[PDB]
Structure formats: C-alpha cells, structure tokens
Design a protein around this ligand. Structure first.
Ligand SMILES: Cc1cn([C@H]2C[C@H](OP(=O)(O)O)[C@@H](COP(=O)(O)O)O2)c(=O)[nH]c1=O
Ligand SMILES: [Ca+2]
Length: 129
C-alpha cells in the first residue's frame, strides 16, 4: 500500500470527511472502523477528535487498500493519515471507534487496529468505560 495526497475540504463526523483527491471533492469513509453517529454516545467526542486531527494537519494523505476503493454510496474507502499518523488507528486507540467492517481483501491494517483496540479496552477508555 502507498500514501497519496489529498486536502481537507470539511470535517463531517468521526469516521467520514470531505477531502479533495486527484482534484475532485469526495466523501471518504475510513476503513476498518466504526465511530458512533453524532446523535449517539461518544459521537460528539469522535467527531471532535477526527475534526481536530484533520484540521490541524499540515499534510493529509489517503491510502487505499487492495480491494474496493469506493463503497455503494460513492464514498472513498481509505486509511487516512494526518502528518503521518493514521486517524483510523488513533480513534480506535482512544476508544472512540470500534474495529468494524472488516471485509476480506480490504483488511491490510486489521491486526494493527485490533492491537490498538485491545489497549483502549485495557485502559477502559471512552466506549469501553
Ligand atoms: C466501512 C465500510 C462501510 N461500508 C458500508 C457498509 C454499511 O452499509 P449499510 O449502510 O447498508 O449499513 C455502511 C456502514 O457505514 P456507516 O457506519 O458510515 O453507516 O457502509 C462498506 O460497504 N465498506 C466499508 O469498508
Ligand atoms: Ca458510523
């Protein structure tokens, strides 16, 4: 897998955002995670977390996996990096997302994220509190 450039257009919520990629606006959905919706518990904290991470970043990058690059809603499916730090992993490490939606053929970073989840749980953080 390799990282590609993008720029932030707008934060949306814990696990989706609007990026410019290859010069075109797209909504991206983060691979392998599920944040609560804004109306759900820890939804607002997830949205805030993602928003800060991507708005403060000097450099946003997207990394597609080996499989499907867009979902059925037209959303890009990627791992998202903010100055080299994976947003998807950072959410899971903070107990603000669950590892989820692990489809075969698009799960290169599964074990990395599962390790983060285990530490969040040990710490009883947020969703695991
Ligand atoms: C994360 C991800 C979600 N999806 C689809 C599955 C879910 O379909 P349904 O909408 O039919 O439930 C939906 C979950 O995204 P959200 O958590 O953003 O709602 O997006 C994929 O198809 N591939 C993926 O990698
Ligand atoms: Ca969600």
């Amino acid at each position: 897998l390799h990282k590609e450039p993008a720029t932030l257009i707008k934060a949306i919520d814990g696990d989706t955002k609007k990026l410019m990629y290859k010069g075109q606006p797209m909504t991206f959905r983060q691979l392998l995670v599920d944040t609560p919706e804004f109306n759900e518990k820890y939804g607002p904290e997830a949205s805030a977390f993602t928003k800060k991470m991507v708005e403060n970043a000097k450099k946003i990058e997207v990394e597609f996996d080996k499989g499907q690059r867009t979902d059925k809603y037209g959303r890009g499916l990627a791992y998202i990096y903010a100055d080299g730090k994976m947003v998807n992993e950072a959410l899971v490490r903070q107990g603000l997302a669950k590892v989820a939606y692990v489809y075969k053929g698009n799960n290169t970073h599964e074990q990395l994220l599962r390790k983060a989840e285990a530490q969040a749980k040990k710490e009883k953080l947020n969703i695991w509190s």
